[PDB]
Amino acid sequence: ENMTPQDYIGHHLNNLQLDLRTFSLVDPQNPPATFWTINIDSMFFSVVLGLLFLVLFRSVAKKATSGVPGKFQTAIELVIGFVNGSVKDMYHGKSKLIAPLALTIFVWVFLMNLMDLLPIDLLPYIAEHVLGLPALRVVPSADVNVTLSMALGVFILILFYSIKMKGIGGFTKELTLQPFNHWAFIPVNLILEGVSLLSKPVSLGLRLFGNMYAGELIFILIAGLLPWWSQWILNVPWAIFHILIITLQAFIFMVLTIVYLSMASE
Amino acid sequence: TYHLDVVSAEQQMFSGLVEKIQVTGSEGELGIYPGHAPLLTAIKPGMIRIVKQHGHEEFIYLSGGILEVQPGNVTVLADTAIRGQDLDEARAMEAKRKAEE
Amino acid sequence: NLNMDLLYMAAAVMMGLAAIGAAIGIGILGGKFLEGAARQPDLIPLLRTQFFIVMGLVDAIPMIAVGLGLYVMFA
Amino acid sequence: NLNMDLLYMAAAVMMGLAAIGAAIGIGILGGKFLEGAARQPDLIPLLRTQFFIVMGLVDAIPMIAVGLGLYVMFA
Amino acid sequence: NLNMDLLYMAAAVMMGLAAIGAAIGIGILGGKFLEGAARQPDLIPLLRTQFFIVMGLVDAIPMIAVGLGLYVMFA
Amino acid sequence: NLNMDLLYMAAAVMMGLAAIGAAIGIGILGGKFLEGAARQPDLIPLLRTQFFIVMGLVDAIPMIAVGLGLYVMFA
Amino acid sequence: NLNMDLLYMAAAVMMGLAAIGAAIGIGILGGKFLEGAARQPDLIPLLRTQFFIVMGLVDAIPMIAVGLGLYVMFA
Amino acid sequence: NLNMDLLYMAAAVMMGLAAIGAAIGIGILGGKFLEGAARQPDLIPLLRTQFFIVMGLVDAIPMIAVGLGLYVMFA
Amino acid sequence: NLNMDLLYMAAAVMMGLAAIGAAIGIGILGGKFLEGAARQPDLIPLLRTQFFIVMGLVDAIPMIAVGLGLYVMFA
Amino acid sequence: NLNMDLLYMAAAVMMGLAAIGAAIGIGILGGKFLEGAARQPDLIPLLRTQFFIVMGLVDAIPMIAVGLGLYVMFA
Amino acid sequence: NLNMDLLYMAAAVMMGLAAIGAAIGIGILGGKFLEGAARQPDLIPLLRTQFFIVMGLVDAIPMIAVGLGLYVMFA
Amino acid sequence: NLNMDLLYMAAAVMMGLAAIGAAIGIGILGGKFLEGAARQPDLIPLLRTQFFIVMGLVDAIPMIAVGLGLYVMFA
Amino acid sequence: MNLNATILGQAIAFVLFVLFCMKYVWPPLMAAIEKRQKEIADGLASAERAHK
Amino acid sequence: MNLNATILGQAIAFVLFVLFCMKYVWPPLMAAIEKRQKEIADGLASAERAHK
């Protein structure tokens, strides 16, 4: 096995893409021949995590009662406590969609990130040496396209909710008069306020991605460069810290979503 | 406009609704416009300037005391005579002298 | 030739300084916002409105340097 | 060659420095305003209009640094 | 060939400015939050929702400069 | 004939440092103007005329620095 | 060739800036905590817990820039 | 040869540090004057004399730098 | 030309900035501690333990950055 | 040749940093004198005695720096 | 041989940064100790001990950077 | 030959940084002495002795760095 | 790194999970909560007129 | 180089990671759960007696 430490490290930084023109898997060498080249590993892990939230919750959703809850049900209704507690004060309008929007973002974003603590080489081994797969990595959020798809989803929602709840007639006024309000500045005003809007979803996408990308890379290096005794003592303190990061990024994305929309509609 | 009361332990010096005042605080001058921030401080001996509502400007001498503010209601707790720890210590000695007699 | 990297790094310096101006300007504006809230929570729903106007200007210059940094990357 | 490559280096670094000045400065002046509003909210209109006068002078020097920064970008 | 190395360098300075900009900005903002909590511990959940309205804006421009820093790393 | 590469650089660095110096210096001053205004609004007319008097001094060296920036930029 | 060691100079800048950004930004935050802790000493956990939230984000970005410092040292 | 361009950059960098050091120094000094002046109208004429005396000490070393800046602009 | 001496220079900038970040951050932190001591002499053995726990979060990034500079003394 | 330029450029940073260091140091020290003077004007003559005495400590280190800068410029 | 001057630019930046990092850091710490002393004279003998504790930590990290300052003279 | 004037150029950098460290550290320290002195002038003789102790620690580390600057100038 | 069609592939997966929890998970749970919040309110409310 | 050392490294790390979690992190989870669960017990007690 001729993988030098630098070369071993490379295989974890490489994805398992398709190519729709050839209908074929990418090997660890060949390039993306076209945009139509979906990242199978990021999606496959991302949807299985989604189902094991939705199935567990819908099992209890069918069964919940006004008595003392079952202990597992108690944690579900408690995380509903955190969710509803945030929604309950930051949102003030009628809309239904806000609450399940925030919930499905929070718990699903977390599930992606919780998988990163799973041993970095183990599951790629069952990828390569069992089912014959040329590469893997085990954190959906560490691939940019998932974070952009959700954050550009929230961007759609910002446009949609804002135009719904104050119309274009005032939306144009805000996007053009502000911040100086005096009519000569309007052309220069819109430039600054436009790219200010687009900086909102971008802040979601980049921050979330960057923490989980840079999270996994440290585990790649921990595995790749070191003897066993020094891998465990360096990995323990990093797990304590990465706990905190993988929770906070889920919480921040939730809160920021609600705040960004609230700021436009209310 | 705000309801101001200037009071002392013996008598209530002044009261009513007021457009603004200027006051010599312990640290410096302060102006109470309508709905000013909550405040607590000691105030220095001297004239203070009142402008009552409908603009009737006036001077009140105070021998000192405490100022408090909150947006709807404000009051000054004025002392009658110049207060000093040294002067009060002198009165405390004076008080003992009588006890001996 | 090397001149292609030095025009790229020109975007990098434009971005770098402009990011500190906007981050700390918003942070000092934001820090005094919290002192207003620390005294008087009933003011904070008012204070969010005036904060967002003043923060709007703090972006106005750095956002110009942000966009030109994006253009100079592509061009 | 080098004259046009370095033209990129100058206009970008000038705007980066000007984006620091024009955003730190009115952030500081932003925090004192937002405190003064939390002090005396009958005077948020009076403070805001007073605050605009002060801000215009702050911006004046940095705006010229963007002005030269685009003029070197155009020429 | 120097073209490769100086692109590596241009990301590293741009990255350090964005790291300082974010870390200082939310440190300042967080300090006033902890003063508010020590002064007024009944309101700390209310202040927590205020502190996070502001924190995201401080991060926004430094994160753009990280986005260009990682693209100049990647390309 | 390289020499104009540094002539664009010399105008940029001196204007940038003057843009920071001016905008921070009157930015610090303008905050203390707002503190004095909120302390005694009957003296915003006296403190605003005083603020203009003081800030005339504060900008003076940066005002010469922008003037040399124009000179080196054109010539 | 030198090229591998030029990248060591890039990682050195990037990690050093991160070390300033980290330790200043938390030192501001920790100072407001310890002054508050002397005034409000029953509730030092309530300050501590919130303090560790702010610490988490403050260190996270310098941890990235140090990561890129690790990366570029290996190249 | 280079002797023309470097001297402008040489005067530019030295003039830049002087411009900051001046405008910050009296900015700090002039701010505390406005706070002290708002404290005490009786003192603002008295304190005005002290503002000018103390300002004369701050501006000396920057004036050595900008004086040498013109000397190098000529020579 | 200078390959080995440039990695020794890379450890010089890295070891220097790392010294700044640490020294200031715990200097600020200790200053705010000594105001607590100078006011509440009954709390000091508690406060000191809180000072060390916070200081245990301050020094980490500096202590990484000196590490890669000493590793560049292995290099 | 390089040798003349390096001598005068070494002198320009010596004066540039000495100009900042003294201007900020006296500006800070002077601001505390102007606040104190507003507190009680009969102190201002007593305060000048302490202000000039302590300013001599501040001045002594930068006065080494400008002497050695001029000596090395002349040498 | 050119390797010699790269040791001295390395030696100058390592030592010069470390000299700033310590000198500001203990300077800030010393200022809060003095007004603490001006508040509470009977604590100053206690506060002398407490000051020296924090001084050891602020020295500890720059002491690494000056030690390498010897090793670059050894190099 | 490039060597001698680079060696003195880097030595002057090491001196210039240490001069700011000293100038600002006593400046910051000196402000808290003068404003504390202004409250209670009978302390100013007592406080001066306290000034000279604290300043005695501050001016150890820069004065070493200036002493090395002279030692590198010697030979 | 790679600009990629995964950005569309995730848009389809996200909306279907949002609909799964909206129309089948949140209303059942939150109704059981708000019906419990009411029920406990009756206990104090019953006693409110019992002593009074 | 050998890579088999990664099996021992990642095994030992993940055990110690669980040791910290169980002893410090599961108790607050279960306790906020018990603290939440108590509201139903008080609510049922107060509703039972007040219907009585």
Residue numbers in the entry:
A (entry chain a): 4 to 269
B (entry chain H): 3 to 103
C (entry chain M), D (entry chain R), E (entry chain J), F (entry chain S), G (entry chain L), H (entry chain N), ...: 3 to 77
M (entry chain X), N (entry chain Y): 1 to 52
Article excerpt on this structure:
A key component in the generation of cellular energy is the F1Fo ATP synthase, a biological rotary motor that converts proton motive force (pmf) to adenosine tri-phosphate (ATP) in both oxidative phosphorylation and photophosphorylation. The enzyme is based on two rotary motors, termed F1 and Fo, that are coupled together by two stalks: a central rotor stalk and a peripheral stator stalk. The central stalk is comprised of subunits ε and γ and rotates during the enzyme’s catalytic cycle. E. coli and other related bacteria exploit an internal subunit, termed ε, that can sense the environment and inhibit the enzyme under certain conditions.
Here we present cryo-EM data showing E. coli F1Fo ATP synthase in different rotational and inhibited sub-states, observed following incubation with 10 mM MgATP. The three catalytic β subunits in the present study were identified as containing β1 (βDP); MgADP, β2 (βE); ADP and β3 (βTP); MgATP. Masked 3D classification focusing on the central rotor highlighted sub-states in which the εCTD adopted either a condensed down conformation or an extended half-up conformation. In this study we observed the εCTD in two conformations, a half-up and a down sub-state. In the half up sub-states, no density for εCTH2 was observed, however εCTH1 remained attached to subunit γ. When the εCTD is half-up, εCTH1 provides an additional link between the εNTD and subunit γ, stabilizing the conformation of the central stalk together. When the εCTD is in the up or half-up conformation, the εCTH1 binds to the γ subunit, clamping the central rotor together. This clamping would stabilize the central stalk in a closed position, increasing the stiffness of the rotor which, in turn, has the potential to impede enzyme turnover by decreasing the flexibility of the intact enzyme.
